[PDB]
From a paper:
The α-D-phosphohexomutases are ubiquitous enzymes found in all kingdoms of life. Among other reactions, these enzymes catalyze the reversible conversion of 1-phospho to 6-phosphohexoses, with various sugars including glucose, mannose, glucosamine, and N-acetylglucosamine. In bacteria, the enzymes [name] ([name]) and phosphomannomutase/[name] (PMM/[name]) are involved in the biosynthesis of exopolysaccharides that contribute to the pathogenicity of infections in higher organisms, including humans, animals, and plants. The reaction mechanism of the α-D-phosphohexomutases is conserved, and entails two phosphoryl transfers [Fig. 1(a)], with the initial transfer occurring from a phosphoserine residue of the enzyme to a monophosphorylated sugar to form a bisphosphorylated intermediate (e.g., glucose 1,6-bisphosphate or G16P).
Numbering used by the authors: 1 to 448
Write the structure that this text describes.
């Protein structure tokens, strides 16, 4: 067998049986063998085990002659930004993002914060670590502490015209992850009044693990927006590379609609640019990008595909319906901070509420949201769906699972490559009744 903690795109596992300090040190040794010349940036999140795992990673890297740049407690996007900004050979973020408290992990990048994934170095590292019975060497390189966030903060602020910002009232919900530290460092430079919910970093997570998709966690942000009359609310996952929006009514905004909104925001700054989007939900993004003078570029979902497509296209922005937003000028990386700064600027400049900015789009292209199905046989379940609809002759696309376009409605059906888990997304052309009957029909077929 193989080490279960090595996944398709990162390392994650239960501490200490799936991930521990010895494994972390061996990963540092293995990573040093995979990178071009240069130092390695290390950062970590608020989880209790994260500092010790980072220190073991540093020990392995320095045993292999790599200088380490320790940027300390941070978000995942800061490892991306500093790896690129400091022209490092690579970087590692120690984080489990949104997983349970006994879990941790790592996200690995090389030069320019390019992802290291299972087929681009991560499984080479796994097998090296798995075979490594060598004695731990001693450090032949130094660690430098570099916690200065000035360049990162200046970069974030460069996305908005601060003289155009209004003193909006914004709920911010770090979920006791790390986002509140960055909010507080941005605040002196912004006119907003912040309503801070679950703000203090606490790896014990007394208010729940940081996952704004859980309805109970969703409701703390919604309640703060409604009780304070806030313009909108923002919540983050624990390492805040994902953000989530709540309009002034407390309504959680489905991430699909943020792709089109942010693309229009960016295209006003970078006219004629290309915008990369995923295949799960498409019609609204294609229309909004084209109306703003941009060029939409379809791409398989998952950050490694999006980033490499953005690079090959010189795309200014990429967005996934699942709360991932990527920016060319940000090393083609994802940020949970840039998106809400852009949205706050859009609300400020337009005089429109976030609710009204998305309302007509939600009416024009209603969607199901992503619906997950644990099935006995994913391949047979997909076959049942496709056989049922064969007589309607949908237009089929295989960019990412199966996309089927029927004219006034479409769906995307994708398989989990690890667990027998299908993911369904449906959308229609302004027809909520059709959305529900087709969603339920597909659901019945999948469960059959
Ligand atoms: Mg995350």
């Amino acid at each position: 067998m193989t080490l279960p903690a090595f996944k398709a795109y990162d390392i994650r596992g239960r501490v200490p049986d799936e991930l521990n300090e010895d494994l972390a040190r061996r990963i540092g040794v293995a990573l040093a063998a995979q990178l071009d010349q240069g130092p390695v940036v290390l950062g970590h999140d608020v989880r209790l085990a994260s500092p010790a795992l980072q220190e073991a990673l540093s020990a392995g890297l320095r045993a292999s002659g790599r200088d380490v740049i320790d940027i300390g407690l941070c978000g995942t996007e800061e490892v991306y930004f500093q790896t690129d900004y400091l022209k490092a050979a690579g970087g590692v973020m120690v984080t489990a993002s949104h997983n349970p408290m006994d879990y941790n992990g790592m996200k690995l990048v090389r030069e320019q914060a390019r992802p290291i994934s299972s087929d681009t170095g991560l499984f080479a590292i796994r097998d090296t670590v798995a075979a490594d019975t060598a004695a731990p060497g001693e450090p032949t390189a130094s660690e430098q502490s570099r916690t200065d966030k000035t360049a990162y903060l200046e970069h974030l602020l460069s996305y908005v015209d601060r003289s155009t910002l209004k003193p909006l009232k914004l709920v911010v919900n770090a979920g006791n992850g790390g986002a509140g530290l960055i909010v507080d460092l941005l605040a002196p430079h912004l006119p907003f009044e912040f309503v801070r919910v679950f703000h203090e970093p606490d790896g014990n997570f007394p208010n729940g693990i940081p996952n704004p998709l859980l309805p109970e966690n969703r409701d703390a942000t919604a309640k703060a927006v409604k009780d304070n009359g806030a313009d909108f609310g923002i919540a983050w996952d624990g390492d805040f590379d994902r953000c989530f929006f709540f309009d002034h009514t407390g309504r959680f905004i489905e991430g699909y609609y943020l792709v089109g909104l942010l693309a229009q925001a960016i295209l006003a700054k970078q006219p004629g640019g290309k915008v990369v989007h995923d295949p799960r939900l498409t019609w609204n993004t294609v229309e909004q990008v084209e109306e703003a003078g941009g060029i939409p570029v379809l791409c398989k979902s998952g950050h490694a595909f999006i980033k490499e497509k953005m690079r090959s296209e010189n795309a200014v922005y990429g967005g996934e319906m699942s709360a991932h937003h990527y920016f060319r000028e940000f090393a083609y990386a994802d940020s949970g901070m840039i998106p809400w700064l852009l949205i706050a600027e859009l609300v400020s400049q337009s005089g429109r509420s976030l609710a009204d900015l998305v309302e007509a789009r939600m009416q024009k292209f209603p969607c199901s949201g992503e619906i997950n199905f644990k099935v006995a046989d994913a391949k047979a379940s997909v076959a049942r769906v496709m056989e049922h609809y064969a007589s309607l002759s949908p237009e089929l696309d295989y960019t990412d699972g199966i996309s089927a376009d029927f004219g006034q409605w479409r769906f995307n059906l994708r398989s989990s490559n690890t667990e027998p888990l299908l993911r369904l997304n449906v959308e229609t052309r302004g027809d909520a009744a059709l959305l529900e009957t087709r969603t339920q029909e597909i659901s019945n077929l999948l469960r059959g």
